[PDB]
């Protein structure tokens, strides 16, 4: 059928709509307040102890950077995906730990200090070595350089907007823990309102529910990737002789990954017309890993009460 770009096209204003900028600022505010409320339940003594003994952090880095990209590459080779799909899944595999993993570990209620230390060190190591690993794994895909397209401003801004609320929470708990109730209650109400706003606004901002036109095996691999990440983290931590409380957080940190940098690199490399449903692929991958995490939460809460 020759080779032609997809009929998928996007509105011209989509680049600089006021709605997109509003969505971006609301998401940044949401992440800031999530991280504030989630650092309000931490302490610096335990994070210092965890960084002193990097066993959990080391296993997290190994599970996210040595084995996850390799299995993403093997999945791309075995499933016989195209060039764009293979590059997309590879970039998703090589991405650092997402900030959603902190909330999910809080749901699993395990070792928040260790989770935050591994996620910040994983973002730092992403900035350090995503280019070289993406380069060695992209032989036969994207003959172009690809080293200068990964975001570096985005990574440092994400690190800063994650560290600032955590630092504020640490300092506030250590110095004067007397406005926990009011601040956390206001945070919860504003986060619920913000989530409602994001859910309503994205419905009209995204549109074009033609995402099912994505080929089924790409959905299959975007389904298997979060689950294989979760299983890999859990098995690697368990068979490495670590306690139960400190292993669920490692597993669910390795399973959860950032995906906005995949969107940035794909949109810099290719036009929205060459990219078909892979433009909305990262959004599908994120919500699917969210659903898988919720299923794991249900399993954990069915095992806890019994």
């Amino acid at each position: 059928n020759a080779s032609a770009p997809f009929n998928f096209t996007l509105p011209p204003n989509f680049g600089k709509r006021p709605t997109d900028l509003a969505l971006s600022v609301i998401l940044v505010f949401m992440l800031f307040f999530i991280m504030l409320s989630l650092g309000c339940t931490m302490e610096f003594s335990k994070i210092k102890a965890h960084l002193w003994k990097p066993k959990g952090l080391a296993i997290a880095l190994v599970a996210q950077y040595g084995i996850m990209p390799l299995t993403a590459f093997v999945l791309g080779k075995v499933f016989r995906l195209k060039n764009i799909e293979a590059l997309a899944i590879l970039v998703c595999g090589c991405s650092p730990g997402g900030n959603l993993s902190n909330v999910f570990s809080l749901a699993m209620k395990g070792d928040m200090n260790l989770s935050i230390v591994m996620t910040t060190c994983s973002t730092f190591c992403a900035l350090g070595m995503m280019p070289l690993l993406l380069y060695i794994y992209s032989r036969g895909i994207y003959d172009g350089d690809l080293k200068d397209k990964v975001p570096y401003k985005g990574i440092v801004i994400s690190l800063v907007l994650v560290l600032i609320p955590c630092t504020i929470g640490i300092v506030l708990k250590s110095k004067r823990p007397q406005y926990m109730r009011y601040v956390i209650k206001g945070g919860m109400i504003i986060i619920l309102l913000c989530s409602v706003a994001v859910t309503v606004l994205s419905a009209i901002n995204v549109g074009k529910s033609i995402m099912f036109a994505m080929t089924p095996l790409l959905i299959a691999t975007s389904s298997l990737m979060p689950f294989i990440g979760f299983l890999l983290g859990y098995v690697l931590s368990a068979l490495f002789c670590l306690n139960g409380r400190c292993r669920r957080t490692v597993s669910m940190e390795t399973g959860c990954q950032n995906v906005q940098l995949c969107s940035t690199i794909l949109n810099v490399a290719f036009p929205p017309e060459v990219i078909g449903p892979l433009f909305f692929f990262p959004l599908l991958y994120m919500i699917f890993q969210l659903g898988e995490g919720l299923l794991l939460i249900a399993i954990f809460w069915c095992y806890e009460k019994f």
Partner: antibody
Amino acid sequence: EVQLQQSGPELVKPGASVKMSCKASGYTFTSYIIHWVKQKPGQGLEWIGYINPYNDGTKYNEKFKGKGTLTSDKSSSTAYMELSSLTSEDSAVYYCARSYYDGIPHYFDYWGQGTTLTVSS
Amino acid sequence: DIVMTQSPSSLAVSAGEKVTMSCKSSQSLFNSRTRRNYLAWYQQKPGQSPKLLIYWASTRESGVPDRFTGSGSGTDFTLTISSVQAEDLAVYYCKQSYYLLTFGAGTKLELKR
């Protein structure tokens, strides 16, 4: 349908500084890449390089790395080529070819009529 | 790199003779992930720009006669014309694009006397 319009014949001194343009108006200009092929008289085709008009990223042949310099203009929907270093041996026929490019350029489905360039005194 | 070598480079076909052109490439230009086998055959009648005939070494471009069929895999490829008609006099190149774009030497056609 689509048709790629070349610039026209060029006659320059051995002092170089010549530029060639390839205008293409049949499609969405940023979806495909534009190649450049050099053909000496009776010596077969020879690849020079291509330009991706979306991100302005270029790839060149090892031999033509020093000389060729490919630029693209989204507004005017044309792709350029500058040599800037010419000798008597350089005169040939230059074509611009359009290929679809997902991760690897696929094939040259459409070609231009060609620019016959002559270098002499 | 890959250097593409066309075997005949000159032959004469009169009315219905086969052509069985062949260019053997250098290494395996067959993508394992996508079973596509990157290759393309262009026909350049004298005084004209080259025209695409075969893409992916097996599929013919819409607009060519049914006479031009391309068959091959791995490194050995073949192009056959079957009933060579009068206007089939050109040069065929069998470019490859697996790693880096390279064209073949070219095969010329004449008529027997």
